[PDB]
Design a protein around this ligand. Structure first.
Ligand SMILES: Nc1ncnc2c1ncn2[C@@H]1O[C@H](COP(=O)(O)OP(=O)(O)O)[C@@H](O)[C@H]1O
Ligand SMILES: [Zn+2]
Lengths: 439, 439
């Protein structure tokens, strides 16, 4: 039923109206209303699509005729047409039913005539027998593929598959309810907040959330612990998101204090800056890819970005370079800070070449045809991007020149404890002992 | 049947002439006439061109052979031409047949001589099939294209495509006929004036009218209504014009307020400016693919806007950003105003280059061949595009400083009601009650 699927409500709604056709056809038939023969399920791969068709067919009283397309590439065909007419003939025997077809690209496709001959024979067997039934009091074919490009053109004609619905990647409460639905099978520990890790994986599927819960339950289960707390879930989250953990790295103390001032710079002026996304777990662990990460947890839309949040994240992307300038002098800035620079540059161009956030260019969209404009407007636009980043590093220079005490406290706090929460960062910046085993 | 194509009386008269030629040759072949070897239908998408072809074919008793131009994959070298040789090869075995080629402008384009080997093998095979060495008898080719000016000189030669029937977009007395025809298929309508919906929807085509009617019938089915009344036609009409409504997930007083100020800006600019098209509705709901939308709609159908209308468009597309800066200050202008600047950019740039509405540039067309022109002229042109947009936002600011009370009124009532047609806005702007229910 519609309880088993989690998230994806904008597809579930049109599925309950088409199922409102499905359990009572004669009402929609008596007035002259018509609805398409078969609907098309698209979207990213593996977002709970077969569970939408099984959920519709399961909550209604109907039969669910499942068949895959890729299984027609297992053998030479000509017989696949015969099992298709077996399938639709059996569907006309059991008149309240729906017919789900998985990976429709393998039935269709645009191929060489040596195999487009009989592949076209099974294909237009499907095309003929999509026409060999009256729509009245009949059956609705549901077809699903994640590649709308690979589908055959003649199969997508009016008189055939018409209404196209999208099954996309879920939002924050969608991932919260998917994560809860997979939490309903393992042994949890305490107040395990699903919404603190629901946001935290921005734009990822549902099956990978099953990998998150599954690998986290494995990792708790080999430690011979009691249950699965928050540490296991954020452990497997920080494995699937970035990468594994290097327990074999032997590194000096100058490097540890250098990256300590880098992460302390990002953490401080990510913390004290007007408008930023609030602070979260900062570390200096080499988590696979990077060496020291600051985490940040927002919960709004990106449409609610503004000029204050854009200048806020431009000030977040200068704390490392300005921290390493103000501590170690000028001629000792490293190169990894330059990686942070590219994120800054991206945001800066969106403040000039898409929005109206620059009073010297004018209100325009310079982004969709950049090559069309001449050189003078690109000089004014690129110049405004340059003074935007210079003003960002000037504000970062002063707000880290007047917060030096928290920079050293949070710095050697990251040297001694090497993992801090925002509550714990607040305890470090006040000069307070924080009741935790050091490392 | 020719009755099924309601609207397009004169073009249908033209094809009726050909069917009359087929049904008794001797009346027309008595002075030396012959069948036109080719007829080319022109007109925008979905105006009923294949409908006419199936009218002649299915009405005159000859085999109809469909083939689409946007179906030729062009992944390999040989197929495409092989499809044409097979298609014509099978059509000659059914001598009085008809061959319909849809979207010629996808395969038959300009034969640029500097195309290496394989771009124009299909077009050459087509040319040799239409008017080649061995003659064809009793075959009629009907080619439906949207851009007659894009086809090449060789394919539109008198001898391959004899006539050029123009099926243009329907007018009000035509739309009344289409609506009458498709409403006729419904068995039940209580009291509905087709000229109401016909005068209400300028610019729509035959297909959008057909699914207007069908969506109204289905919508009457869902609500378990007894009939098909005018409110249903209004729901389906607003659906097709403004976009499919989406169930309101969530909102806050802040987001809802800011949005109400945005569409309040577009709506006030739409009303009080001069030259703008009339106003239809303002909405605070998430309709279609946008957060609220103020839809304008002309009373009469115009072929081309003058300078005052387009300057009116430039002034209307600044109400969002200017309203949000008057209310929420400069530093809070969101990034949802990107589409406004995209559209306004398009309008101004088509004003300067194509339409020839600027004096320091001159009476010259710079749109096509944009690469060839030098950098001097591009500098002047882009200078006047940007100057024109800056001036537009100047006017929108200076007007929305004069309409604070109307702005806050319409925004507040728009919060309270979530939807408003132009009359209700006219009442709300003067502080009057609307006689309906809050929220
Ligand atoms: N003159 C007309 N009379 C009746 N229906 C029309 C007319 N023109 C377009 N339509 C409608 O448009 C829809 C699409 O028809 P089609 O022939 O596929 O469009 P096109 O030939 O422009 O691609 C049909 O449902 C048809 O009812
Ligand atoms: Zn807008």
């Amino acid at each position: 039923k519609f309880d088993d699927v989690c998230g994806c409500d904008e597809a579930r709604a049109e599925l309950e109206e088409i199922v409102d056709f499905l359990k009572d056809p004669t009402k929609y038939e008596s007035l002259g209303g018509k609805l398409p023969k078969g609907v098309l399920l698209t979207g990213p791969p593996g977002t709970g699509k077969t569970l939408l068709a099984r959920a519709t067919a399961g909550e209604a009283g109907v039969d669910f005729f499942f068949m895959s397309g890729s299984e027609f590439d297992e053998v030479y065909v000509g017989v696949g047409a015969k099992r298709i007419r077996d399938l639709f003939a059996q569907a006309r025997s059991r008149a309240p039913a729906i017919i789900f077809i998985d990976q429709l690209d393998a039935i269709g496709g645009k191929r060489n005539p040596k195999d487009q001959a009989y592949a076209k024979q099974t294909l237009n067997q499907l095309l003929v027998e999509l026409d060999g039934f009256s729509q009245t009091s009949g059956i609705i074919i549901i077809g699903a593929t994640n590649f709308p490009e690979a589908l055959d053109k003649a199969l997508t004609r009016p008189g055939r598959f018409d209404k196209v619905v999208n099954v996309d990647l879920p939002d924050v409460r969608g991932r919260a309810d998917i994560l809860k639905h997979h939490m309903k099978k393992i042994t949890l520990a305490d107040n395990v907040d699903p919404t603190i890790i629901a946001r935290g994986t921005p734009g990822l599927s549902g099956a990978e959330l099953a990998n998150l819960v599954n690998q986290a339950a494995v990792y708790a289960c080999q430690k011979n612990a009691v249950s699965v707390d928050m540490s296991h879930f954020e452990w497997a989250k920080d494995k699937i998101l970035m990468g594994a953990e290097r327990k074999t790295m032997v590194l000096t103390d100058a490097a540890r204090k250098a990256t300590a001032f880098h992460e302390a710079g990002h953490a401080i002026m990510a913390k004290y800056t007007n408008g930023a996304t609030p602070l979260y777990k900062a570390t200096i662990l080499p988590r696979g890819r990077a060496l020291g990460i600051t985490f940040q947890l927002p919960e709004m839309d990106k449409v609610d970005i503004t000029k204050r949040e854009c200048q806020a994240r431009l000030d977040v992307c200068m704390g490392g370079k300005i921290a390493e300038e103000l501590i170690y002098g000028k001629d000792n800035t490293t190169s990894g800070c330059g990686s942070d620079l590219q994120s800054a540059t991206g945001t800066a161009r969106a403040m000039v070449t898409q929005y109206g956030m620059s009073d010297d260019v004018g209100p325009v969209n310079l982004s969709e045809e950049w090559e069309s404009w001449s050189n003078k407007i690109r000089d004014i636009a690129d110049n405004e991007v340059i003074e935007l980043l210079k003003d960002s590093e000037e504000r970062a220079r002063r707000l880290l020149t007047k917060k030096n005490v928290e920079l050293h406290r949070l710095a050697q706090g990251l040297i001694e404890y090497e993992t801090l929460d925002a509550h714990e960062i607040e305890q470090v910046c006040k000069g307070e002992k924080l009741a935790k085993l050091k490392t």
